[PDB]
């Protein structure tokens, strides 16, 4: 019966990823004065299925100079971690209830960078190596700031339990208390998901395809699925963190609908951002994260430590 819950979490996520791609293409098209997929199925609704079927019936290539074990392992790790990050999210009840769910997401997101690193290095090609090193630089840029932002926001929650965030935001959204932290968190989530304007690891215009340039067919499909699942997961995490839906214990699907709508809004905002800005330079991304975000984040961490004591507003939990 827990296996059924696992499947009911895994299969819909993959379906949403598949259709996210269609949504992504259509939104970009209409923002570019065109239509996007509207032939393969009514309103392009069968286009993701055709893409999935085409990719998995195409020949997978194993490069001659590549390291076989890491080359095959990296996409498996990417997709498995992308699926695993969903289990502690309360919608409004988590599949897995952790005392420290936030730390769990932090650690697993930190371990998801190795799929790009091992993939790029094991491809044994120059563009893949450049993509992997760009991933190293990206993580060095965003990690500390993201962690300190998370700590500063959760100081008003009282714990690292994700469900408690629903109780914290029963009357007001946390974005009205920490909007300066919310903006930096949103930018850091763009940087963490390798999304425009921070898509340096792929860098199509600069690096052809980046870390996955040598991947074809099914493994490439899994890398794409992992990336889009990460998009949806991170936006759901942001919606839980800063826009708390009201929960009725006898009426939980109201919370589920509200949370899904907020997550879709944030994902559509991601797609909107991709269509509006030029790409950063990765040294410029590091300088942005270390010279602007880091000092403000440190100051706001001090402020959000002092404020609950200042006003006698410390949250309940130990």
């Amino acid at each position: 019966m827990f296996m059924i819950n696992i499947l009911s979490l895994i299969i819909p996520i993959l379906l949403a990823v598949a259709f996210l791609t269609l949504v992504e293409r259509k939104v970009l098209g209409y923002m570019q004065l065109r239509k996007g997929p509207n032939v393969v199925g009514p309103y392009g609704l069968l286009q993701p299925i055709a893409d999935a079927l085409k990719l998995f019936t195409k020949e997978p290539l194993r490069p001659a100079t590549s390291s076989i074990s890491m080359f095959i392992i990296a996409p498996i790790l990417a997709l498995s971690l992308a699926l695993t990050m969903w289990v502690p999210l309360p919608m409004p009840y988590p599949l897995i209830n952790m005392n420290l769910g936030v730390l769990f997401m932090l650690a697993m997101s930190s371990l998801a960078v190795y799929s790009i690193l091992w993939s790029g290095w094991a491809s044994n090609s120059k563009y893949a190596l450049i993509g992997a090193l760009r991933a190293v630089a990206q993580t060095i840029s965003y990690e500390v700031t993201l962690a300190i932002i998370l700590l500063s926001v959760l100081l008003m929650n009282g714990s690292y339990t994700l469900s408690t965030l629903i109780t914290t935001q029963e009357h007001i959204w946390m974005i009205f208390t920490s909007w300066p932290l919310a903006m930096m968190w949103f930018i850091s989530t763009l940087a963490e998901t390798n999304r425009a304007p921070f898509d340096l690891t792929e860098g199509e215009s600069e690096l052809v395809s980046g870390f996955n340039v040598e991947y074809a067919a099914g493994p490439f499909a899994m890398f794409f699925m992992a990336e889009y699942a990460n998009i949806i997961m991170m936006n759901a995490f942001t919606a839980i963190l800063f826009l708390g839906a009201s929960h009725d214990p006898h009426t939980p699907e109201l919370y589920t609908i509200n949370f899904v709508l907020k997550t879709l809004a944030l994902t559509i905002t991601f797609l909107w951002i991709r269509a509006s800005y030029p790409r950063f330079r990765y040294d410029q991304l590091m300088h942005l994260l270390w010279k602007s975000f880091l000092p403000l984040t440190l100051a706001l961490c001090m402020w959000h430590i002092s404020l609950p004591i200042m006003t006698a507003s410390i949250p309940p939990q130990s």
Binding site: F56, K126, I130, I140, K291
Partner: protein
């Protein structure tokens, strides 16, 4: 136990997808097809040659800054103590020292990449 089952399920699903990807289609692998890609021309050197890191000092600093967040993460629980003044003083001291280290590295050109 449930988390172990979830991890096993995810890894099994990914591995099964890899197996179908590699065993369903028809493979025609020859030496030209599997050669490394460098935009149509052969690579000059190896991809296993050293690749300079211009952000090496920032990379080293990242280790100490990463341990600082590990130091700072128990603050939600620390805010429940009776000696609130002491805990606040120590938390502010830790953050001030982190900010001072960042300022020192910034002023001495430690954040500029090597040319």
């Amino acid at each position: 136990m449930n988390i172990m089952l979830t991890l096993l399920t995810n890894v099994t699903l990914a591995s099964l997808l890899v197996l179908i990807a590699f065993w369903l289609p028809q493979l025609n692998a020859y030496s030209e097809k599997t050669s490394p890609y460098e935009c149509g021309f052969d690579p000059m050197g190896s991809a296993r040659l050293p690749f300079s890191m211009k952000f090496f000092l920032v990379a080293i600093t990242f280790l100490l800054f990463d341990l600082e967040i590990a130091l700072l993460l128990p603050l939600p629980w620390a805010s429940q103590t009776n000696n609130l003044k002491t805990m606040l003083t120590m938390a502010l001291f830790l953050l001030i020292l982190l900010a001072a280290s960042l300022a020192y590295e910034w002023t001495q050109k430690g954040l500029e990449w090597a040319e």
